[PDB]
């Protein structure tokens, strides 16, 4: 039914221009160097650029529509490493943003003492470098289906490392930090004129962590089920499910913008000003 | 061209050293939290500052809970304050020490608070309201000679709020008077301000051992609200 | 006797008004309507000077037009090299609050002030190579607003005590006090002849004083609110003042009269700093509404906007050779406009 | 005494200000025009300067 | 120049009505917020009442609540304080002060030192 055709083109046309816009807005902001969260937001926007561009366009258009005649040795298995590094970069830019939010909310006084823009650049480039360095063993990634698979001893360890590095650790630490923030800002006595205060922050934090968990769970569950188990190899059940599970990750990566940047009114006003700036 | 090259290298080395020194100072400037004291002429500014020093501009340095604060008490200046008050925009909180026993200057204190709250460079700073001289207020109300209703006609049609938290040894009349002053300040505080800055009322005396903790809680809440507004959490 | 004194004061005031009316004839705008309009002036940003931690109140371009000084409430008196964007010096002030900065024509001394009521003077060319307090001037009462260097030995300083005092750094004494203002005097500018200067107070008055005789030669009035920006015309027979009522005036010394009002309906924010160019067609004035304006001094028409700043623009300085202008705002940024 | 002294200072200052030679303001306007037109060429801000002379670009 | 001249004010026994008229010139009357300030013999300065630009934001001091009536006529550049039911404590000098900055709701105009933007005041004796 051309589900990839109808879905991935829309995903590109929705995510890529919006993330380019937020990149150009955040790059030229004067207050970008004054405060730290905008640097992480720009990093996440750039990670979105790499993820959507490389994965959605290059891989899941070229090798799925007009390619896979490509020799797998050098080019395909280098582009796969690049895609995996992009995904890891997106997740491990999301993580430090959550840590910074937790610090700035639970410990308002020491936020500037423990977080400063000089450390922000170090931690914003170290994650990129370590993702690119840690993705180089993903060169030997198990080609899915194809003529034969063979349960090579590197396949299970690669899958387990990918799971622990994309879902298991980030989701657990998001759960812990968001639960701590919610408990601290709900149990402690806040201002009297703050009736519509705890509900909004609790809903936002919990919906962020819940949408991340629910949009990245199927892929991990599926790859673990493929590593273990005794699949029946029904082409519909094992491959259409594979496609629907793989599309949810890119859906999450695309909606990360709507979750983070679009919510803030200070960004909505800038977008409104800049949409008519060219004319 | 050698002279130009070595001059450029010397300038670059000096610039690098200045960058290092400025970063080292930057590690200090944000650590301290700036404070400012404002109020009437006879308000207990220097009394509170001197009292908690143990724990022109008359500065003071103190650290509590592993973070330090800096309080500014200008007293070597004139009584016209529309020009040097713009300097204190980048201040974490403003402490408004106010007279509570002398009701003659209460109107002037309210006008001063109204000017600060509605100021078009001080509309971001949270204001800490210290109702100083509570013991003298209790002594004056119990005496009954002052006739608090003379200075404020609408005090007669007033009752203690439902959320009042009087001390066990207090009197309904004195708690009524202090909460009346508190509400008179808060009605000015509440009338303007769309959540940008918050006013916290606090019943404090000059010789009080917990004056630092009140400022701690006020500053913590103010910075928490500022960070929440800064983030998407609003 | 007091009633008679008030009556004769009013008589002299209306006599002065009648003299001004007799010396009116025609307006400058009517007789200068034949000038070719300058048109749009597009000034971009050349280099951004970002090394400060707090807001900036005072800057002063050097005589060599190569290096400039800046102020910050952290306590820094950084001397910048605009051509290379290199910080050649960084002076840690004793008092965190500084509002005035002056650069000596000799290039060896840099001044600072603030709420400390101290006009500290720092020397640069020293054997040990480290900056230090040359002299600690004291004697003022109000907040110190604007100081300027007459020469290497004398400076004129304005404070919040309604007085302007001329000092002697060598002996550290107040040679003459100019006590004629009602409100806080904020900005003063030095004429090219270094013998007369004009000071602006918070009483909508501009007073032209005589440096030698130490008296107010004449006074200028016509603003509605307090004025905090003032600057001599290069010729020395005119000067512009910027008040808080979103108006810029241009009083001439010889005629004691207002010439134009540089204001617009859509401007509601007050002027902070003003600075003429090296010719006269260019009158730059700072503003509170996160930008700067470039007025034409001969037609009262807006020509160009130096937008690109956050918070309040609190200073404005044009180089002696007129190559560029620097606008520092509260965002701890200094921008060079060509 | 203080009020009388202040009034005396004010009246003497204003009478000093009154005894000042006034000049026709159109002559001042002509002088301003002459000085402004006589230095248009040397102004870098008014007339744009080539990038070779300007050291900021 | 900015001139603030007050009109009216005479010896009136307790009771009666007095109309204090403020003459304003040299500035736009509508933009600026104005107020009245008193000066009792042997005491300092105090604030009486103030009105905003439109005149619908009237406020009064604690001492007098219904005994005064402050209003403005922006067309004729005049400020009035209709006073009645006087008391012997109101034997002060009334100055027609004006807040410095146009288009704002904050002003510091109770200074003991000679505030620039206010008149000499008219004496009222009860
Ligand atoms: N009994 C009592 N006395 C107090 C209290 N607070 C201040 N005082 C007294 O009030 C007097 C004046 O207080 P100050 O702090 O010195 O006033 P100030 O701020 O310095 O006034 P300025 O000259 O304008 O700077 C002091 O001698 C204190 O003893 C209080 O809470 N209770
Ligand atoms: C490029 C990568 N593409 C792939 O990972 C293709 N392989 C699988 O989906 C798969 C499924 C079950 C078991 C195993 Cl071991 C692998 C990818 C990247 C982002 C989203 C989706 C896909
Ligand atoms: Mg004091």
Numbering used by the authors:
A (entry chain R): 26 to 304
B (entry chain A): 9 to 63, 206 to 384
C (entry chain B): 3 to 340
D (entry chain G): 6 to 62
E (entry chain N): 1 to 126
Q: Which passages does the manuscript contain on this structure?
A:
The structures of GDP- or GTP-bound intermediate states of the GPCR–G protein complex are very important for understanding the molecular mechanism of the dynamic process of GPCR–G protein interaction and signaling in more physiologically relevant conditions. Here, we determined the structures of nucleotide-bound GPR139–JNJ-63533054–miniGs/q using optimized procedures on adding GDP or GTP prior to the cryo-EM sample freezing. Importantly, three cryo-EM structures of JNJ-63533054-bound GPR139–miniGs/q complex in the nucleotide-free (hereafter referred to as GPR139–miniGs/q), GDP-bound and GTP-bound states were determined at global resolutions of 3.2 Å, 3.3 Å and 3.8 Å, respectively. In addition, the αN helix of Gα in GTP-bound GPR139–miniGs/q structure is observed and forms weak interactions with Gβγ, whereas αN is disordered in the GTP-bound Gα crystal structure due to the absence of receptor and Gβγ.
GPR139 activation triggers several G protein pathways of which Gq/11 is the primary. Here, we report the cryo-electron microscopy (cryo-EM) structures of GPR139 in complex with a key reference ligand JNJ-63533054 which is an analog of agent TAK-04110 in clinical trial, and miniGs/q or Gi in nucleotide-free form, as well as the GPR139–JNJ-63533054–miniGs/q complex in GDP- and GTP-bound states, respectively.
